[PDB]
Amino acid sequence: EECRVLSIQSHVIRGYVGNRAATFPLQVLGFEIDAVNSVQFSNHTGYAHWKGQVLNSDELQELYEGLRLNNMNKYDYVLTGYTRDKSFLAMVVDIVQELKQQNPRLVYVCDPVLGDKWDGEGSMYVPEDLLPVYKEKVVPLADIITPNQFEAELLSGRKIHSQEEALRVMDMLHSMGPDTVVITSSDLPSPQGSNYLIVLGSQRRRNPAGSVVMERIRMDIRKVDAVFVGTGDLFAAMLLAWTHKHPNNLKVACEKTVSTLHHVLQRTIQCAKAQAVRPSPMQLELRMVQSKRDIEDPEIVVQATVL
Amino acid sequence: EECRVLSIQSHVIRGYVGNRAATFPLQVLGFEIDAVNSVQFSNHTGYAHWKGQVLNSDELQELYEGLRLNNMNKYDYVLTGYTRDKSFLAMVVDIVQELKQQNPRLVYVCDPVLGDKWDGEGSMYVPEDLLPVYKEKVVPLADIITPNQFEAELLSGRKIHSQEEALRVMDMLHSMGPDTVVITSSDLPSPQGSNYLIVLGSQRRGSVVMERIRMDIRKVDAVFVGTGDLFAAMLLAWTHKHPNNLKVACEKTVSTLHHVLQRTIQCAKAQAGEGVRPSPMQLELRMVQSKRDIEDPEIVVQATVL
Ligand SMILES: Nc1ncnc2c1ncn2[C@@H]1O[C@H](COP(=O)(O)OP(=O)(O)OP(=O)(O)O)[C@@H](O)[C@H]1O
Ligand SMILES: Nc1ncnc2c1ncn2[C@@H]1O[C@H](COP(=O)(O)OP(=O)(O)OP(=O)(O)O)[C@@H](O)[C@H]1O
Ligand SMILES: [Mg+2]
Ligand SMILES: [Mg+2]
Ligand code: NA
Numbered sequence A: 001e002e003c004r005v006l007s008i009q010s011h012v013i014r015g016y017v018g019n020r021a022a023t024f025p026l027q028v029l030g031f032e033i034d035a036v037n038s039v040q041f042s043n044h045t046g047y048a049h050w051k052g053q054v055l056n057s058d059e060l061q062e063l064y065e066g067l068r069l070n071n072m073n074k075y076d077y078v079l080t081g082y083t084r085d086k087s088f089l090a091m092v093v094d095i096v097q098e099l100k101q102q103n104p105r106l107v108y109v110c111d112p113v114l115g116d117k118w119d120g121e122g123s124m125y126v127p128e129d130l131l132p133v134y135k136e137k138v139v140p141l142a143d144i145i146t147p148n149q150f151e152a153e154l155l156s157g158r159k160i161h162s163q164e165e166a167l168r169v170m171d172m173l174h175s176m177g178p179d180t181v182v183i184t185s186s187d188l189p190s191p192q193g194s195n196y197l198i199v200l201g202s203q204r205r206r207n208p209a210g211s212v213v214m215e216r217i218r219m220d221i222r223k224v225d226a227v228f229v230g231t232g233d234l235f236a237a238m239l240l241a242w243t244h245k246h247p248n249n250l251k252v253a254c255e256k257t258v259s260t261l262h263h264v265l266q267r268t269i270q271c272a273k274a275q276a277v278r279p280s281p282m283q284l285e286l287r288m289v290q291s292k293r294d295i296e297d298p299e300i301v302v303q304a305t306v307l
Numbered sequence B: 001e002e003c004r005v006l007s008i009q010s011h012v013i014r015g016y017v018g019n020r021a022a023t024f025p026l027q028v029l030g031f032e033i034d035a036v037n038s039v040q041f042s043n044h045t046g047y048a049h050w051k052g053q054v055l056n057s058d059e060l061q062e063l064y065e066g067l068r069l070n071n072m073n074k075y076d077y078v079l080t081g082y083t084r085d086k087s088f089l090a091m092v093v094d095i096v097q098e099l100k101q102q103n104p105r106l107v108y109v110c111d112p113v114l115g116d117k118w119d120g121e122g123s124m125y126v127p128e129d130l131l132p133v134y135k136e137k138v139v140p141l142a143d144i145i146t147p148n149q150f151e152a153e154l155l156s157g158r159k160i161h162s163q164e165e166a167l168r169v170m171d172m173l174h175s176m177g178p179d180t181v182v183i184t185s186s187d188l189p190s191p192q193g194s195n196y197l198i199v200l201g202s203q204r205r206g207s208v209v210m211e212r213i214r215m216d217i218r219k220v221d222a223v224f225v226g227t228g229d230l231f232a233a234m235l236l237a238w239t240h241k242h243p244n245n246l247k248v249a250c251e252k253t254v255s256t257l258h259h260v261l262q263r264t265i266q267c268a269k270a271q272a273g274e275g276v277r278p279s280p281m282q283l284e285l286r287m288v289q290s291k292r293d294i295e296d297p298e299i300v301v302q303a304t305v306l
């Protein structure tokens, strides 16, 4: 038995973002993940310097023809994240369409990377003309999506000020296409204090009996004093892995996903501090490799609230 | 404690060869390996088809520049394998010289891929103009080299017909520079039967001792791709953990390959059915499913000290 994933994301030489944050973890859990590298840079763009090349829609299509010609275009999952250009994204959409025709049971996990917000206001970090494509072509095709608060607000067109508006926006997202919507981070208020970020998740599904039900959860995570890159990619990847293992249990899938990132960042936070005192982007690269054990079976450190 | 490896080799979307065969195993064993993909192809060339793009020498330098500007050009090991381009390989050389000045203790593991021999006749599968660069530029720089028999013959200029000629040749290789030379496969005959392939290893290491070892590996009925790359990467990992113990390091390298292929050849057959010969697709290494065998391979081959 084998579960095949096609992950189209960026590659870097040094560090863990994109395909570099998604691949090792999924491989450790038994997945035959195939990495299509949308770009190859020396490191992520949060560093003072970075150089590299990008893959264009033509080349992505060639890579695909190669696979198709060998009749190797049969996947169980497809996984996308940061996509920098409309032309590429329209191509990723054509590829997902054909893979779904090839296999109707294919699950498309899509991280709709658009931007994020810093201390109150958010701004986009991909071309604005990608939003219409995400709205009309990509999300309708998705089975699981992992937007942060900023991205859900752009996808739904509604600002989110409360948990209830969050739920309403999540329902809106469900109606665009995906049965699983997880808001990966938000500045919603927590009763635990203000040094907490909020994760919300909602999954629609049919039970053996055949009724269409919805599981909803919330997690209040304590904030770590640092900026990490790649953890959004890691979140989407682990979510793929754990909903795959616990299909009818969003609570457990999310707790394992959020617990894995917690163990990775705790281990990362330790070494960052030891090597420094104000850690640079380099010292803050996720301690991926050293976290093998926590990825394989993470001790659950945060229980979710049931909504 | 961290050990960084810069691995420059090919990437495929489907399968395991190059950085694909070298990365996961080394990550599993705790290495901070950075993969520079010399190419990005849909799959390896053993298939009916393949499409893809290549990385040029200028792009390689660009990537290296980025790392340097950030003071990220400090590594414990460099690993390179199949390159089909002379300009690209010269750039790898300039890069390895550079990383060595930055860290004199850097260990360069070079798999000098030039070709192989099929039934007895060997044929190159890299342009000829590479050989001069390898003999004159690459090998003198290398600390560990992993050539198969054909490559050891091409690199030394001598034909190998016996275990003694082989070790004679490994010695010529040590003189070109490398302290550890391992011949990853040869047609030498084994006392165990015709169904065996021979691996020979030699390491030079205030005494100047010489350790030499041989292993008799049981041939498996099928042609795999990426096993040479896996061999070089696992050798780097094990030489790293058992430093002056060529014997143990080769034992774990080869045992690991054995489990992976045993596991691979089994699903191969399962998917091809009784009597039918597995395709390249079916024969792709079962990498991910061999995680446990990579972390701690059960030793199933003892090396003989020559
Ligand atoms: N500073 C932090 N402190 C604590 N946990 C964090 C921190 N940064 C990230 N995380 C963890 O990473 C997860 C996802 O957050 P992150 O902000 O990195 O991505 P995002 O903006 O939600 O996603 P994207 O833009 O990739 O779709 C959190 O929900 C949490 O589990
Ligand atoms: N058909 C096979 N049967 C049994 N073991 C094999 C077979 N093919 C490869 N191996 C294993 O793979 C290892 C390396 O062998 P392989 O022939 O693939 O590379 P090579 O020709 O020595 O290397 P390179 O071309 O990368 O310089 C062997 O030494 C052995 O452990
Ligand atoms: Mg964020
Ligand atoms: Mg061979
Ligand atoms: Na997200």
Ligand code: NA
Pocket (backbone or CB within 6 Å): B111, B146, B147, B148, B184, B228, B231
């Ligand atoms: Na070899």
